[PDB]
Write a protein that binds this ligand. Structure first.
Ligand SMILES: Nc1ccc([N+](=O)[O-])cc1C(=O)O
Ligand SMILES: Nc1ccc([N+](=O)[O-])cc1C(=O)O
Ligand SMILES: Nc1ccc([N+](=O)[O-])cc1C(=O)O
Ligand SMILES: Nc1ccc([N+](=O)[O-])cc1C(=O)O
Lengths: 420, 212, 212, 420
């Protein structure tokens, strides 16, 4: 059997490339995944996987289709996300928000370019094709292959005045798809891990640290000189509080690094946004300033602890501030992973040619939709070609992508013919 | 659960007599499948009863909805009819199993059907629940005047928002006055309601002054 | 036919085991009542078959639709489930009888239900048809080449727009080529259709030249 | 039992008047029966008769409710119509279209006034109340009483450019309600017959007689003198044709009078409308003029005959015209009427105090909703207090109205306790 499908995949290498660029080209930042979901739905429908739209909103939804099997076998789920990181105009976060790379995809040489291809249509293209190969090669499976393409993978979260349809992400994402029928015995999340599989990922907690100062004064009445920490301008105290937290951040990852079977979790910290006062009324400095911090958690850290830690960092400076968490998610290590791990491993050795190695710490220290599967008792690990977009890599090698498709196919052939 | 039959025929051409299970009208086979599933349901709860520290979970089954064909074009019976089943799970049952069970019940009748799940949620037992359990108990004994007793199996075999908390590692239990609405009770006794408020309060004063 | 059961219960409180005919879930009782009606239907066509000059009427029955509870809130089974039945009548049956008959099928199972008719149309035999039949026959014999034969019972046990004409005293019969769609046939032969045009045409030339 | 209900009705003598006036005040010409239908629906719901709306349109519908019985007895249907004859502005047909009588109802003395009460809320109020009396007196009936209030009873029919929702009448009327579940063993249509019951009514056929002439000429070129029948102006020839048809009409009723068990049917003719050319471009006379004729039919006449008859009147004048029929309905005599006739007669003798007499020919020669019931095998006859609105009566005597309610009641008790 295995050789039948392999020759078939070489049959669809161009289709592999076409599918990636066509998919990569669609503008699908988180919040607008709709166009891409529609693309995949039709693609899936065209090929007889009989897709369904699972979503909270009619323009942001997941697509679930499946390659039915003869019966009485384990079922395997393949997962990838529709959204991409950068919107067309994200001038707030990127110095050159117009680079061709951020918003398009193209075949310039044996490699495919585009942040939207690395994250994450390249992998999605891989297993979408793999499913095509199996069906088209009439391979024998006793169990279903479930094709789950989801939205809201990326860590966009509603906060403050940003609520609702536009800002929601993972709440309506894969966990929605699963809780509403996209269930399997096992699940493989396809993302760029560099052909190294990992079955652990990290939690996260988001804190909005707001520091109070005052009282407001019209600029001509502002009192100087004053020590930074004693400033009335809340932006000034925040400047000091940012440097304290940066030193706390350097230590946090070292203290909380944890080694797991699935990987070694190095949980990092970052200050993603700041804002105090408004740009269109600056004549009065603001009595309060806020920062929004992204703190990763190993599966065993309690978000309540980390808050008290940061509350502490504030108290040590004698600052008065409000530390409030506005996002909490848990990270998981896979349990009962062996059947997929092995099924994956055999395919990998055959195609890649050597044993699999431990993944890089970042790839085990992020959010991947394996956490939702594991949360709900579906053992899941992540494996795909190339290097992580967060790195960030900007291209895929058509050869590696073809390999990854071979591995996915072979994994399915192995795993789907085992009885649970 | 959608069961397939057919082919559809204009009523003047419907063939009879035919056995229920071989009916071309899918509503008729569904009739048989409903009765098989009702017996399966009777046993499902007994087999999957599980006793936990937190309570005894007796998971029931019910057919919440049925629908085949449309009321505004009945001149042709339908080639397919569907039912919607609500199957409870103890914290330790994998839903794929239950689907396969129901899949089996269908196969025993020689029917062709599509069993597809459109909801899956997990039930949990609290871990590290003790501090809250203890805090609650002292308050209860002080106000109600007697120890707390094991809850009824139904109250431990349903969906309550304790599952999300426990799911995310916030130890949780459920406690309040009156008898369950699903029972279903229709009123509360204001004294009972007043007691529950004291317990909540006392539990807070107790638990919130302990260091985690 | 709407059958009542109850009381509704949250799935965790549903009482089992219970006999089907006594289920609180109206879908379950409906499963039984559906099978009862299916046997009554088998006999109904035999008992109400009638021979008429125009043809022989075999009036059949079918259960075109079912629906109980709503697919998007199944946590509580329904206290009522309804089915929509299509019962054909020969020209001489009164619909109140048939209602009273089905009301009976319900009473025999000890069930409580509401049998309410939401459609009634009358069937007719042509009177004074002879001029058209004769004109029709002469043309048919000329074109098809053989005598006309009695139609199959289904074609006389359905609805055709002859009933309105007859209802209003315009003698009417139905005739055309190919085999019935309810059967159901899926095509026509260009030759037959061409013949049918000849027969219609010829019929018109004869009949339209007769004085009323 | 019977005395229990009789006394009960006197309890609701005021309620009888109130429901009549309240109903009568609602503006409910054909085409606008909705407000009145809504009123009856609430009245029916308010009294526990559990009504339903049966209609083609959401603003023109029939109301069906019923008083359930113990079981196994004949069911009797009570029927009356919601619509009324005159619209608020029907300046086209009435010299004084503003008389208070045409559009209101009031209690000025032991009588109730209003064309809308005579036709037809007075009778509807009568049985609406009788169902109330029976239910409230907990009378024993084995059979259901069906309460049917219908729309579009009156003979408004779409023609030419007037089609659709606003012009439909009897097609969406009672025959609709019956065909969609409002069936019983017998049916009594409550309208003013002067306490004389009739079980025959007439069909009708409407002809649009259009006469051709010409050629049209600008007025300065019109040729005169010319004989009327040879006029180029079609209004002129039509004038001649109108006088011929008037005489044909005089004989028609005589030739076609027929005696039935239900009554003696005298079928009359009338030219309901005329129109040629347009009032806003009269500089050129018209080459054709049209009239719309209303011809009643006794239950045994075929409309094609009558068409040929009117076609003949035209041919005799050497005129060229187009006689085309745009409405056809059939009249019926009740069959199997006896149980209701008898049930009705006993009550009548008890309350009114003397035997029933033959109805007047006008009441047997019109359209009443008995024809739909009889068309569908529900033996039906018409009986109610007062004198016919077409007559036209302008009031009801509360005493007469009260009796009729009693007769409706007593009849129901008798008939509904008989086994079919
Ligand atoms: N899951 C991810 C989410 C976000 C980002 N990112 O760099 O913004 C990358 C990944 C990834 O899979 O590498
Ligand atoms: N969680 C519940 C959910 C539903 C229902 N119900 O009876 O519909 C009751 C409860 C309950 O708490 O008793
Ligand atoms: N008059 C018909 C009405 C319905 C159907 N049907 O198959 O549903 C067929 C016919 C027919 O003419 O064969
Ligand atoms: N059925 C009727 C229809 C029309 C008129 N009308 O005078 O307009 C009266 C009656 C009647 O019932 O008398």
């Amino acid at each position: 059997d295995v050789a039948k499908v392999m020759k078939t995949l070489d049959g669809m290498r161009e289709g592999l490339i076409q599918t990636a660029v066509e998919l990569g080209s669609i503008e699908a930042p988180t919040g607008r995944e709709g166009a891409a979901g529609d693309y995949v739905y039709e693609w899936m429908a065209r090929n007889g996987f009989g897709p369904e739209r699972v979503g909270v909103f009619d323009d942001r939804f997941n697509v679930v289709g499946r390659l039915r099997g003869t019966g009485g076998g384990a079922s395997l789920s393949f997962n990838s996300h529709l959204d991409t990181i950068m919107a067309r105009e994200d001038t707030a976060r990127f110095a050159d928000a117009n680079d061709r790379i951020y918003h398009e995809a193209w075949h310039e040489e044996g490699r495919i370019y585009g942040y939207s291809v690395v994250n994450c249509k390249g992998p999605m293209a891989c297993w979408l094709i793999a499913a095509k190969a199996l069906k088209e090669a009439g391979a024998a499976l006793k169990g279903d292959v479930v094709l789950t393409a989801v939205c809201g993978e990326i860590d966009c979260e509603p906060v403050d005045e940003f609520q609702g349809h536009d800002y929601l992400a993972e709440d309506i994402g894969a966990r929605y798809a699963i809780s509403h029928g996209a269930i399997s015995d096992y699940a493989l999340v396809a993302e760029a891990t560099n052909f190294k599989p990992a079955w652990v990922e990290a939690g996260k907690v988001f804190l909005k640290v707001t520091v109070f100062a005052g009282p407001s004064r019209y600029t001509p009445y502002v009192p100087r000189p004053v020590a930074a920490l004693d400033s009335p301008n809340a932006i000034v105290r925040m400047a000091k509080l940012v440097e304290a937290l940066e030193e706390w951040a350097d230590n946090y990852e070292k203290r909380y690094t944890r080694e797991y079977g699935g990987g070694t979790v190095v949980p990092k910290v970052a200050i993603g946004a700041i804002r105090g006062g408004v740009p269109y009324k600056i004549y009065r400095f603001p009595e309060l300033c806020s920062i929004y911090m992204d703190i990763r958690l190993n599966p065993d850290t309690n978000p309540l602890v980390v808050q008290r830690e940061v509350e502490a960092v504030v108290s040590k400076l004698g600052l008065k501030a409000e530390v409030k968490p506005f996002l909490f998610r848990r990270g998981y290590e896979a349990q009962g992973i062996e059947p997929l791990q092995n099924a994956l491993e055999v395919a990998h050795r055959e195609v890649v040619g050597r044993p699999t190695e431990r993944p890089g710490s970042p790839e085990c220290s992020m959010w991947r939709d394996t956490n939702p599967y594991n949360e709900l008792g579906i053992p899941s690990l992540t494996y795909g070609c190339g290097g992580g977009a967060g790195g960030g890599n900007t291209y895929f090698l058509v050869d590696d992508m073809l390999k990854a498709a071979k591995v996915y196919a072979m994994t399915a052939m192995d795993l789907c013919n085992r009885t649970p």
